[PDB]
Amino acid sequence: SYQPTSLTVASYNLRNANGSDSARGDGWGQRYPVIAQMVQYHDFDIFGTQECFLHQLKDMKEALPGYDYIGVGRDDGKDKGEHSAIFYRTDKFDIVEKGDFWLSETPDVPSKGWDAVLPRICSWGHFKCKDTGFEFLFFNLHMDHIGKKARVESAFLVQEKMKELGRGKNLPAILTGDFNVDQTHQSYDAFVSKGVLCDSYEKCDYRYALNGTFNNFDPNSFTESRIDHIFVSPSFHVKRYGVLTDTYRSVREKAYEARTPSDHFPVKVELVFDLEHHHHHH
Amino acid sequence: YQPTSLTVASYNLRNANGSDSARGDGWGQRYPVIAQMVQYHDFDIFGTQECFLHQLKDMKEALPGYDYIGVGRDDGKDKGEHSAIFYRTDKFDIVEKGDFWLSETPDVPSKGWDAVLPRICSWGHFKCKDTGFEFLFFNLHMDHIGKKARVESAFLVQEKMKELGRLPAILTGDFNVDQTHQSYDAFVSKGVLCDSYEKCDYRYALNGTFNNFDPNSFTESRIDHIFVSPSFHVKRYGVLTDTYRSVREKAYEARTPSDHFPVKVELVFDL
Numbered sequence: 358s359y360q361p362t363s364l365t366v367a368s369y370n371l372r373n374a375n376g377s378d379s380a381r382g383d384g385w386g387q388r389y390p391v392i393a394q395m396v397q398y399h400d401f402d403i404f405g406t407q408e409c410f411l412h413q414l415k416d417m418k419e420a421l422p423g424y425d426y427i428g429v430g431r432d433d434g435k436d437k438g439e440h441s442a443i444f445y446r447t448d449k450f451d452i453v454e455k456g457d458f459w460l461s462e463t464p465d466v467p468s469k470g471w472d473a474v475l476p477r478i479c480s481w482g483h484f485k486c487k488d489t490g491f492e493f494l495f496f497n498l499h500m501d502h503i504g505k506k507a508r509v510e511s512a513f514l515v516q517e518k519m520k521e522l523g524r525g526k527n528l529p530a531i532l533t534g535d536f537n538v539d540q541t542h543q544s545y546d547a548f549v550s551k552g553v554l555c556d557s558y559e560k561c562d563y564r565y566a567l568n569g570t571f572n573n574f575d576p577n578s579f580t581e582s583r584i585d586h587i588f589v590s591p592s593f594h595v596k597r598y599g600v601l602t603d604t605y606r607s608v609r610e611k612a613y614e615a616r617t618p619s620d621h622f623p624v625k626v627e628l629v630f631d632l633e634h635h636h637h638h639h
Numbered sequence: 640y641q642p643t644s645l646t647v648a649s650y651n652l653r654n655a656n657g658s659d660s661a662r663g664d665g666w667g668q669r670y671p672v673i674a675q676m677v678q679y680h681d682f683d684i685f686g687t688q689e690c691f692l693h694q695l696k697d698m699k700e701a702l703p704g705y706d707y708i709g710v711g712r713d714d715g716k717d718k719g720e721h722s723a724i725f726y727r728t729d730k731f732d733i734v735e736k737g738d739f740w741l742s743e744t745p746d747v748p749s750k751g752w753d754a755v756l757p758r759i760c761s762w763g764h765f766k767c768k769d770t771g772f773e774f775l776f777f778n779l780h781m782d783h784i785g786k787k788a789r790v791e792s793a794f795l796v797q798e799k800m801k802e803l804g805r806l807p808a809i810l811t812g813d814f815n816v817d818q819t820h821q822s823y824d825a826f827v828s829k830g831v832l833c834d835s836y837e838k839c840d841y842r843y844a845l846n847g848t849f850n851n852f853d854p855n856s857f858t859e860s861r862i863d864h865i866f867v868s869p870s871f872h873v874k875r876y877g878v879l880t881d882t883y884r885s886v887r888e889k890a891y892e893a894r895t896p897s898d899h900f901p902v903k904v905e906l907v908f909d910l
């Protein structure tokens with residue numbers, strides 16, 4: 358028999374480790390243990406991350422017993438630069454296949470695309486659930502902030518890869534990432550306007566959204582802009598969407614102040630997939 | 640056989656008053672967020688403190704799959720703050736329920752010992768619909784002034800558990816003082832009950848439990864506890880620091896859904 362599958366997924370920009378944040382009291386070394394606690398407490402089965410240098414990935418894996426990650430450095434396709442690394446529970450999934458492509462006219466080589474200013478990488482894995490055998494694609498990326506044409510072109514390249522990487526089969530896909538611009542933009546429409554993918558924010562049964570997704574390390578910020586998304590094939594049923602606003606505290610240089618674990622909030626989505634019946638038709 | 644899993648919580652929802660409202664922490668603004676936390680964080684059954692009847696009505700309306708038990712501490716009916724226990728109606732049946740005041744005369748609305756206000760403990764004998772597991776759930780709010788009252792109340796509560804339990808027990812509440820005080824010791828020093836904070840397999844505690852409506856506060860004091868019979872397996876403990884935003888007198892500021900954080904505890908009873 359074919360059992361339905363439940364998954365908890367997330368997208369979380371962990372913020373690259375740098376000296377400016379550290380000086381402001383938002384240093385990686387102070388933040389990441391809290392990030393790891395959130396992943397554990399909020400039961401992320403598999404999640405896309407953005408902005409991590411390799412040293413940050415190693416820290417996170419050390420802080421996350423039972424997780425591994427996939428995804429290469431965007432600068433040279435090896436250890437250099439920020440990653441779009443995907444973390445997953447090794448006791449829950451096997452990797453059937455994994456890869457990376459750059460968001461450009463030449464996706465196989467580290468390169469800037471169209472009008473973008475930095476190279477940008479999408480990392481992916483074809484996963485298989487150890488319990489139910491359910492197979493799916495999980496993509497993760499971080500879009501360019503300057504190149505509008507690049508963002509739009511990127512959206513369609515990702516959709517082409519979603520088909521290509523099925524290897525002849527119709528594999529359901531989950532796409533996470535930092536998309537840099539909000540839901541009013543053309544590159545957002547590029548994913549959803551034809552119903553190839555659905556925004557979990559829009560399709561969830563239950564929405565818990567006390568904020569948008571960027572906070573700029575400001576624990577008082579508010580916006581309705583969402584720049585971190587989880588898009589899914591319409592064959593998934595989206596049960597619940599949450600933005601996690603959890604904060605820790607630091608001593609004010611006893612007086613304390615709220616600190617955000619990263620300069621984004623994680624987006625957490627709970628999905629169900631019915632192997633027998635998962636088609637939509639109107 | 641199948642074991643039983645429960646998510647329980649304790650949450651002081653803060654009495655509705657005009658001072659909080661003027662400061663921008665008004666009940667009408669807070670409770671929709673509190674209700675969302677209850678739902679998003681999957682509370683199966685939770686103890687509340689400080690609610691007047693009207694606040695309980697608001698909560699029941701915002702939580703259509705829930706009902707509550709517990710009477711007002713002023714008159715034993717509808718008047719005064721409650722120690723109301725909310726529960727998912729699709730997960731539990733109520734076998735029996737009751738309330739007692741934390742005093743030398745537990746049967747009637749009354750102040751105890753050196754306490755300055757009447758304090759009530761409300762309880763239910765619940766039966767899980769999936770497994771048939773039965774247990775007691777107690778919930779209270781201790782006095783802020785009466786030290787002897789707090790200590791005596793701890794033993795009275797344990798006495799009532801013995802009487803009624805004669806059923807594994809869970810006890811939630813705002814105990815007003817922290818883990819360094821004698822009334823805390825009175826609960827745990829003999830192994831009758833265990834502090835979820837200490838016994839949990841996994842601890843998520845980015846703060847203590849009281850915040851005074853200050854989104855920047857920090858303390859190692861925990862004044863809200865979930866104590867459980869030793870027979871429970873405590874899987875995980877969390878203090879939920881979620882915050883919403885209000886327009887600053889646009890510019891925004893963080894707001895806490897109440898002046899305490901909820902304590903959420905995931906339990907398993909196996910065998």
Ligand SMILES: [Br-]
Nearest residue numbers: 410411412413
């Ligand atoms: Br590195």
Ligand SMILES: [Br-]
Nearest residue numbers: 363449486488
């Ligand atoms: Br699974």
Ligand SMILES: [Br-]
Nearest residue numbers: 508542543544
């Ligand atoms: Br765009």
Ligand SMILES: [Br-]
Nearest residue numbers: 571572578580
């Ligand atoms: Br912002």
Ligand SMILES: [Br-]
Nearest residue numbers: 591592636637
């Ligand atoms: Br479909």
Ligand SMILES: [Br-]
Nearest residue numbers: 691692693694
């Ligand atoms: Br009332």
Ligand SMILES: [Br-]
Nearest residue numbers: 702703704705
């Ligand atoms: Br509900």
Ligand SMILES: [Br-]
Nearest residue numbers: 789820821822
């Ligand atoms: Br005491």
